[PDB]
Amino acid sequence: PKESDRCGGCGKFTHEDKNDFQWIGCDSCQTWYHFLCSGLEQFEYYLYEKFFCPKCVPHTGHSIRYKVVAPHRYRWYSPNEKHLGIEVGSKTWIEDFITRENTVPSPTDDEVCIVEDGYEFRREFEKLGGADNWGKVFMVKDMDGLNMTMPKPGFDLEDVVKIMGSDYEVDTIDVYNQSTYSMKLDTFRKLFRDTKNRPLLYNFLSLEFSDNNEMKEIAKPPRFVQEISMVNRLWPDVSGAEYIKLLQREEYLPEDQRPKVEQFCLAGMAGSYTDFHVDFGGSSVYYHILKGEKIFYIAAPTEQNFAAYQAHETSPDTTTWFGDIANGAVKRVVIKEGQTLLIPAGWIHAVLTPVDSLVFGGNFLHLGNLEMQMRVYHLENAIRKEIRSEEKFYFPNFELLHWMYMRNVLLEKITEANQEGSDMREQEKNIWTASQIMKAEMERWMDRELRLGPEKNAILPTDDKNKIMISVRKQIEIQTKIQNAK
């Protein structure tokens, strides 16, 4: 081939390969570099008008970044978008938004319930039917009572990067561009320390640390969350005889299959803004502000609001804030240092970060919200039919998780029930109704799979599924025959 076309380097024509297959040219020496060999991290790929490779920087100066020409646009650098409208949430949009931000209505007592501590939460949570009837959002002022393991105050980003590693790569939002890129934790810290100079804002929401032996012990979900978590139910963190018995039955599940979404760490700069959405899979959320402050803008999961949200999301429009077209559905709820927010399935929400913040939270699925979860799933699929998105923004192995839950959990219980008496409505009415609901949804999945084959990759052979569905139908019909008898 040709020498000029050789990184870089790396000194090779083809990278070992995520580099993808992308290079960048040096506006000095003119030699090409594979992106992964340029010295740039993903978040810089679009920042520089003139890129100067490491070989040339001490004698050519740093790289020159585009002039901020359209601060009201995601492409704030493209002079062509100067005349175009203000986009939510460009720098221009967020600034303005902050000034009127507090005019948005507070919630009704039916919507959010504020409690002083976890003990009061427990009592109010129980009054409303508990987790199986959980439909409203809770804000807890003081964690005492929640059994939620958290770092002692004074703990901060500095401790996070030390434990996780300075080279650890986290997915970060470029707020003003409203996109996400990779950034070394170290690189985030440096920018986060520089409070007085911040051309662009950064805020990472996706830092899952359930696989870090040190971290996963410093910040855990509340006990009640752990108890109802479906992911937890399937991939128990047990040991010895327990784990062995868990193996003897084919109830073992690969760690690389587990959805890692229950232990997130979030850090964000003041002026950060994450736009409206529903957490993937219609998952519920715990959310604890260790430092800083967060303002959530929430709307109940009603059919009217879903219709509005679905339109909002599929609409190519970019200038219209969801709140303005939601008919007073959006409410304002502030969370401050030390406080905790508990959101059940379906809630549409946006969030403003008025102040540099460090948060620990997590997403989970639970039987109590099975319908709403499936409703949200439908919502995601409906939206996907129009726009094209990545898969790392939706609930990982959502369908597999249910196949496993049905087979490993619900099915075994209906069976044991069936083997004695035994009316499940007597001491397991909640399990039974979840089974019928999950089965209904799975039947559709099966049908769909037979009407156009499986998907791509893996994992559960159509054969296996069908075998499972045959088993579930049998036990379910048996149980219904028992009930009809009584």
Binding site: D20, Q22, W23, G25, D27, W32, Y45, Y46, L47, E49
Partner: peptide, 6 residues
């Protein structure tokens, strides 16, 4: 910035 993909 001048880039490329192969």
């Amino acid at each position: 910035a001048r880039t490329k993909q192969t």
